[PDB]
Amino acid sequence: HVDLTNCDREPIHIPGYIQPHGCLIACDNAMRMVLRHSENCGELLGLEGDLNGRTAEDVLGKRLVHDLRNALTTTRPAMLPAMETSDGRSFDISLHRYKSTTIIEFEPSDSDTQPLGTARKMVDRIREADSVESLISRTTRLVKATLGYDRVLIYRFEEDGAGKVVSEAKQPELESFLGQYFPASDIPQQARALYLKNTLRIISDASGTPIPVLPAVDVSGEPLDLSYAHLRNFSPIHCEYLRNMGVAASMSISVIVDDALWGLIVCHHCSPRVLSMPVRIAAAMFGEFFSMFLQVLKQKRRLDTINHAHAALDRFLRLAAHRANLEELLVDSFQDFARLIPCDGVGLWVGNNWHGHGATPPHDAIPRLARFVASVSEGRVWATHALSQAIPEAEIYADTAAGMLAIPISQVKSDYLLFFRKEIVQNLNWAGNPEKSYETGPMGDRLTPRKSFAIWKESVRLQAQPWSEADREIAETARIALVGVAFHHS
Amino acid sequence: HVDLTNCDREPIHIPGYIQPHGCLIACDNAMRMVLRHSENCGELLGLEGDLNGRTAEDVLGKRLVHDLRNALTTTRPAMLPAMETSDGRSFDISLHRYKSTTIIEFEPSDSDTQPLGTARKMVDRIREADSVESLISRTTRLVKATLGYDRVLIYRFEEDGAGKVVSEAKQPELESFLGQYFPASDIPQQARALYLKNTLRIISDASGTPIPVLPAVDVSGEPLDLSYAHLRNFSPIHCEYLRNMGVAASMSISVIVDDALWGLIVCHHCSPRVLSMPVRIAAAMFGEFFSMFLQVLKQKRRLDTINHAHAALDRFLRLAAHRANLEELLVDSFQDFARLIPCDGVGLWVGNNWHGHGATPPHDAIPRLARFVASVSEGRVWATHALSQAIPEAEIYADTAAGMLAIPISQVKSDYLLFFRKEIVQNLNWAGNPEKSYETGPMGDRLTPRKSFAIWKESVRLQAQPWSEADREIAETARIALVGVAFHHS
Ligand SMILES: *C/C=C1/C(=C/C2=NC(=C\c3[nH]c(/C=C4\NC(=O)C(C=C)=C4C)c(C)c3CCC(=O)O)/C(CCC(=O)O)=C2C)NC(=O)C1C
Numbered sequence: 018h019v020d021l022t023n024c025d026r027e028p029i030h031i032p033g034y035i036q037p038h039g040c041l042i043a044c045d046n047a048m049r050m051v052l053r054h055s056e057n058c059g060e061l062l063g064l065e066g067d068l069n070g071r072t073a074e075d076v077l078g079k080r081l082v083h084d085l086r087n088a089l090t091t092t093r094p095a096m097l098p099a100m101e102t103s104d105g106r107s108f109d110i111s112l113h114r115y116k117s118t119t120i121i122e123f124e125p126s127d128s129d130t131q132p133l134g135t136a137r138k139m140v141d142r143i144r145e146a147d148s149v150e151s152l153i154s155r156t157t158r159l160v161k162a163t164l165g166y167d168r169v170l171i172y173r174f175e176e177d178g179a180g181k182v183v184s185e186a187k188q189p190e191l192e193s194f195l196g197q198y199f200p201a202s203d204i205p206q207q208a209r210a211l212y213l214k215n216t217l218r219i220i221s222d223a224s225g226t227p228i229p230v231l232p233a234v235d236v237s238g239e240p241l242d243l244s245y246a247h248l249r250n251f252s253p254i255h256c257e258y259l260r261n262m263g264v265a266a267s268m269s270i271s272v273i274v275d276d277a278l279w280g281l282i283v284c285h286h287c288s289p290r291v292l293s294m295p296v297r298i299a300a301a302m303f304g305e306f307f308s309m310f311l312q313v314l315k316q317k318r319r320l321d322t323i324n325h326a327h328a329a330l331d332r333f334l335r336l337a338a339h340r341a342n343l344e345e346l347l348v349d350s351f352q353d354f355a356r357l358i359p360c361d362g363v364g365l366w367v368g369n370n371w372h373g374h375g376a377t378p379p380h381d382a383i384p385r386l387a388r389f390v391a392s393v394s395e396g397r398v399w400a401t402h403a404l405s406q407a408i409p410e411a412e413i414y415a416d417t418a419a420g421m422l423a424i425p426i427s428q429v430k431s432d433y434l435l436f437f438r439k440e441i442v443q444n445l446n447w448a449g450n451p452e453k454s455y456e457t458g459p460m461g462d463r464l465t466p467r468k469s470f471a472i473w474k475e476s477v478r479l480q481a482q483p484w485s486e487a488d489r490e491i492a493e494t495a496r497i498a499l500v501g502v503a504f505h506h507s
Numbered sequence: 508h509v510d511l512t513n514c515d516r517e518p519i520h521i522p523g524y525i526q527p528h529g530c531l532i533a534c535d536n537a538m539r540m541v542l543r544h545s546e547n548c549g550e551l552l553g554l555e556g557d558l559n560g561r562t563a564e565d566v567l568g569k570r571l572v573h574d575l576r577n578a579l580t581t582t583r584p585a586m587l588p589a590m591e592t593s594d595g596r597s598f599d600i601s602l603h604r605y606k607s608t609t610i611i612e613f614e615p616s617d618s619d620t621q622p623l624g625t626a627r628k629m630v631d632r633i634r635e636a637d638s639v640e641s642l643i644s645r646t647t648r649l650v651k652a653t654l655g656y657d658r659v660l661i662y663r664f665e666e667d668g669a670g671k672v673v674s675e676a677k678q679p680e681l682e683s684f685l686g687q688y689f690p691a692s693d694i695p696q697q698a699r700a701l702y703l704k705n706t707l708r709i710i711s712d713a714s715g716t717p718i719p720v721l722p723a724v725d726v727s728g729e730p731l732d733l734s735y736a737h738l739r740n741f742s743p744i745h746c747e748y749l750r751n752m753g754v755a756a757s758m759s760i761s762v763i764v765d766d767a768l769w770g771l772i773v774c775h776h777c778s779p780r781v782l783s784m785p786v787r788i789a790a791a792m793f794g795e796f797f798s799m800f801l802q803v804l805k806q807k808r809r810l811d812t813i814n815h816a817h818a819a820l821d822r823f824l825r826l827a828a829h830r831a832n833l834e835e836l837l838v839d840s841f842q843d844f845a846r847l848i849p850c851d852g853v854g855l856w857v858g859n860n861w862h863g864h865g866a867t868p869p870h871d872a873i874p875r876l877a878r879f880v881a882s883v884s885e886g887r888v889w890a891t892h893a894l895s896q897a898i899p900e901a902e903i904y905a906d907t908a909a910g911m912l913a914i915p916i917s918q919v920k921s922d923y924l925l926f927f928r929k930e931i932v933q934n935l936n937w938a939g940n941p942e943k944s945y946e947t948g949p950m951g952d953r954l955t956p957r958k959s960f961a962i963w964k965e966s967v968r969l970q971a972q973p974w975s976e977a978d979r980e981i982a983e984t985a986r987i988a989l990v991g992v993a994f995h996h997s
């Protein structure tokens with residue numbers, strides 16, 4: 018049994034079933050003996066009776082088995098498009114070895130597509146992108162046009178595991194998910210772990226009858242680990258989700274940046290759809306190249322951001338020299354620091370006087386905040402995205418200021434520069450349709466995009482967009498700049 | 508007993524003695540009762556008999572004890588220059604609370620120096636430094652001229668804990684330590700931990716008679732933790748070291764960068780020397796400001812380095828477009844990649860052909876390296892500073908190439924770009940005098956700069972300067988640039 022109470026702990030790596038668009042044979046470490054096989058090995062390979070106990074050379078043939086052994090020579094599956102069996106039948110074969118068990122996946126052959134050629138055309142069109150936004154927007158559009166899926170999304174993972182739809186290409190009749198968030202629980206930890214091990218992940222048919230593996234558990238009480246198997250069957254929880262959405266097929270591409278799961282390129286189809294091995298090889302290479310280019314562009318953006326901050330602080334220090342009263346200069350210019358760190362408001366607390374700009378807490382609320390900041394600051398940068406978790410009184414003005422970053426501007430006195438952010442739900446640019454409802458199944462209305470979005474909204478209430486490492490790094494450079502020049506003027 | 512066999516595990520935080528230039532009183536959490544006191548409390552404060560058991564108000568006076576209580580209101584010692592006792596005697600007082608024990612340190616008062624004024628003059632002269640090198644070189648010279656110590660050094664800690672003398676200002680007659688390294692064991696872990704907790708550390712007299720604390724251990728079997736006490740006595744191992752060097756006094760300033768111990772500003776004097784509390788306050792503030800400015804300058808240098816790499820790779824990709832044969836371009840231009848990553852040599856391994864530039868392994872040795880690199884690389888950047896630890900055959904050419912960083916330039920073929928570094932002892936710029944020998948003590952010749960340097964040299968044999976995070980980050984950006992354009996040309 019699997020339900021909404023235990024689906025976060027579901028062992029999705031050992032389902033004991035495969036998808037019907039191919040058949041599976043498991044063999045021993047040295048591919049001599051057949052240990053397990055899929056029920057549908059009978060139909061596709063055209064063999065009689067049980068395969069378990071019989072040798073690899075007996076069941077496949079000496080000719081083929083020799084080539085498979087040679088291909089094994091670390092955990093990445095070997096692709097063998099268009100191999101011939103004994104009778105002559107052509108099959109595309111995926112061969113890998115994990116937990117000293119050799120797995121062999123067969124699907125009907127397709128020799129009418131060139132992987133390198135398809136991939137090169139796609140990678141050329143993204144190679145010359147000069148911004149993250151430009152790469153992201155063009156990629157959904159490009160992948161849709163090339164692989165002909167009804168909908169292509171890019172999800173980006175937030176710090177808290179939540180996913181944001183940052184790009185979309187779809188059929189006009191389908192509803193938009195652009196700007197929508199899903200909760201971390203919508204992709205369990207064991208799913209993120211598999212997504213990090215396999216570039217590609219295919220679901221040919223959400224309504225397809227799953228084929229069992231024989232045996233499901235062997236003599237020593239072990240299940241067959243299908244972590245690296247492309248035929249591994251999908252969770253019935255995700256199955257019902259796709260069925261509820263009207264999605265029949267899917268193919269996800271993992272986006273890996275600084276050896277972390279940045280997000281997914283995900284393709285939905287409203288009818289069943291299996292890509293042939295050669296097309297899957299091209300899509301995988303594209304995914305690998307998309308990941309590398311995004312990594313460099315993220316690196317370039319970080320450098321430009323912090324370079325612009327250094328330039329701005331130099332401009333200010335040049336002014337600070339020619340001007341006699343530094344307090345006077347800060348009062349005139351504090352709003353200009355909003356250019357350094359993304360914020361919805363910024364304020365100056367100097368000589369027990371408050372000056373606000375943009376969305377700040379109310380004038381009467383500032384003294385409490387100032388005294389609190391002085392308490393916990395200890396002459397260093399202090400920052401929260403959940404202001405009411407620190408000061409329960411702050412809940413009342415969360416719609417204006419739910420997040421705060423404090424910069425000390427004096428080594429001696431308790432003067433601060435306060436950056437503010439509105440609660441994250443305020444700044445939403447959701448392009449979806451609230452009138453669109455979804456058909457539910459046995460499990461309930463939890464497995465609908467509508468309910469996923471409502472659960473996320475509840476989780477991030479009274480909270481702002483978290484302060485990034487780049488935000489922190491700029492705040493620290495501004496502290497040293499202001500504390501420094503404040504010391505000089507005394 | 509303490510000797511060279513257990514001095515790495517020495518509990519230097521609980522010595523049970525203090526330096527004679529002040530007296531110590533320990534009291535209970537709420538400074539009511541006197542729990543411990545230094546033997547010399549009798550002489551300096553002019554009091555009769557045992558102090559333990561007597562109240563704080565009885566021994567110091569209601570007037571003074573009130574001001575001490577008020578000053579406590581987290582672990583940083585409170586400075587109280589020129590406080591009066593009962594009879595009128597003037598004392599400079601350092602007050603702190605650690606492990607729910609209040610410690611009170613007394614030294615004869617000095618009210619003929621302004622902390623802020625001294626510190627401001629010093630901090631002005633370093634504020635406008637535009638390079639790490641410029642800040643480092645001027646600071647030794649400046650600190651010497653201001654605090655009048657015979658020698659000022661800056662040690663910078665390497666990745667392996669070793670220390671390098673990166674700057675020096677000294678009397679002409681003294682021997683130079685500039686460019687010399689010391690081993691990690693020369694500053695134990697518990698010493699680095701204390702150096703990270705206290706900005707300043709003073710030794711008034713290496714030949715001074717240490718004053719015992721009474722009792723050394725109390726009723727419950729606890730020693731007095733003097734971690735934050737400026738009067739805490741020094742290890743006899745370090746004592747003998749300074750005596751062997753001809754050093755009588757020392758004062759070290761901790762350099763803290765990204766919340767790590769970057770190194771020390773260290774001042775040696777050949778005669779005894781105690782700085783008054785006001786001068787120590789100025790030196791501490793200077794240390795704090797020196798640390799902040801070095802942090803920003805390190806950040807600026809990292810940005811400039813990686814910016815210059817991006818510019819260089821853009822120049823190359825612009826050339827790669829106009830040129831038809833990419834292999835031909837790489838053969839002509841590979842030496843130019845030496846500008847990206849600091850190296851003593853660079854080579855190109857393309858189509859099983861080798862092209863070398865600078866200090867590379869011999870021509871006959873390259874095929875072995877190439878096959879090895881292909882083995883462990885797995886299409887990612889691979890780097891070592893100890894090449895012979897990976898390939899014992901490589902020991903023979905360590906003087907030319909002891910370190911290697913490999914960059915794959917093809918997704919498909921096993922082509923690499925190899926950066927090399929000579930073994931670290933080759934590239935030494937040691938400004939010391941090998942004729943200068945040192946007087947040893949009971950412990951042996953281990954406690955001499957000569958033997959410290961010889962031990963370090965032995966530890967880094969057959970090893971190169973480690974590849975930095977910045978070196979790695981540039982190598983990764985170059986991989987994506989070369990793998991990318993290599994794909995386009997097919
Ligand atoms: C309690 C367990 C649940 C669960 C498990 C589960 N989710 C998996 C994949 C997956 N889930 C989502 C969520 C969404 N996809 C969308 O397109 C939208 C909205 C438009 C949502 C909210 C996504 C995106 C994915 C990735 C695949 C895809 O997007 O098509 C898996 C994968 C397991 C496997 O590899 O077999 C598991 C398991 N999902 C739940 O919602 C819940 C509650």
Ligand SMILES: *C/C=C1/C(=C/C2=NC(=C\c3[nH]c(/C=C4\NC(=O)C(C=C)=C4C)c(C)c3CCC(=O)O)/C(CCC(=O)O)=C2C)NC(=O)C1C
Nearest residue numbers: 514515684689692693694698741742744745757773956959
């Ligand atoms: C086995 C234990 C040893 C040891 C312990 C120890 N060292 C400490 C401080 C310290 N040691 C050095 C080493 C040098 N200083 C130099 O100037 C030179 C060469 C020119 C060397 C090699 C240094 C620099 C320092 C810091 C202070 C200073 O430089 O003056 C301490 C401090 C403990 C305390 O806080 O009381 C301990 C303990 N030192 C050894 O050499 C060895 C073997």
